[PDB]
Design an enzyme around this catalytic site. Sequence first.
Site, mmCIF file in Angstrom:
data_model
loop_
_atom_site.group_PDB
_atom_site.id
_atom_site.type_symbol
_atom_site.label_atom_id
_atom_site.label_comp_id
_atom_site.label_asym_id
_atom_site.label_seq_id
_atom_site.Cartn_x
_atom_site.Cartn_y
_atom_site.Cartn_z
ATOM 1 N N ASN A 100 -3.594 -2.355 -1.917
ATOM 2 C CA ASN A 100 -3.446 -1.317 -0.861
ATOM 3 C C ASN A 100 -3.018 -1.993 0.442
ATOM 4 O OD1 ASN A 100 -6.415 -2.114 -1.522
ATOM 5 N ND2 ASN A 100 -6.304 -2.008 0.655
ATOM 6 N N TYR A 103 -3.690 -1.508 6.674
ATOM 7 C CA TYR A 103 -3.246 -0.579 7.755
ATOM 8 C C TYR A 103 -3.108 -1.353 9.067
ATOM 9 C CZ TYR A 103 -5.573 1.906 4.049
ATOM 10 O OH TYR A 103 -5.989 2.338 2.806
ATOM 11 N N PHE A 162 -12.561 12.569 0.617
ATOM 12 C CA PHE A 162 -12.912 11.973 1.940
ATOM 13 C C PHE A 162 -13.717 12.993 2.750
ATOM 14 C CE2 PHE A 162 -11.385 7.915 3.446
ATOM 15 C CZ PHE A 162 -10.627 7.466 2.356
#
Length: 245
Positions: A100, A103, A162
């Site tokens: 992933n 970010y 989430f």
Amino acid sequence: MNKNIKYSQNFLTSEKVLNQIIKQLNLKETDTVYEIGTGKGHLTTKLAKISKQVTSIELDSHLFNLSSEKLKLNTRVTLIHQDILQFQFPNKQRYKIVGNIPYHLSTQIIKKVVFESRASDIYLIVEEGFYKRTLDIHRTLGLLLHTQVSIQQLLKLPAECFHPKPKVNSVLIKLTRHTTDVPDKYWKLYTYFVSKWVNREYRQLFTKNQFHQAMKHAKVNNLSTITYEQVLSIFNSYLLFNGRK
């Protein structure tokens, strides 16, 4: 009814959603299984059950955690510590780099691995606009890392698990690090081509709407959504008319 959800609690509770796309990857076997990014606590050792080459790039919860490699634990199992990139990204054979994005930094690793590695099957799980920063060659960043990987949006999670009220959408981009659609030589010449073909130098790259006709012919009216395939052909033509191909 009376229910009971008027507090301040939030959890990802998405061990089924994200664990789904990673469990659906379905690899062959000659493709290593790298997992770059952060360290959640539920993957990697399992991702190895697919191929026969597993290695953690972050956190030390891998290798000694893999419940006794059912592969006779005699394949590619290694734990890295600190700096990596040129420490793991090997060469020759095929790999499956499914990681992933923190970010806050990653294009660098995806830069060296996509510049000299042979991943072939790279899956980048990100949640924000990384998948859009790639399909968008109008920034020269996704284009620079696009000519080396054929990505195809496959999974898309709006962050349902989430709770309570998500905010970003995490999707899985099926990147395909292949050889190269642009000759490394004309590669630097390719990026620039994008630069002017990005801002709005269409009347500058065209000698007289000639290429413009080539655009309408390729049903490429608005290249804003263009991923890079068009810029590959369209530019390829400019390379055959000038003299850099």
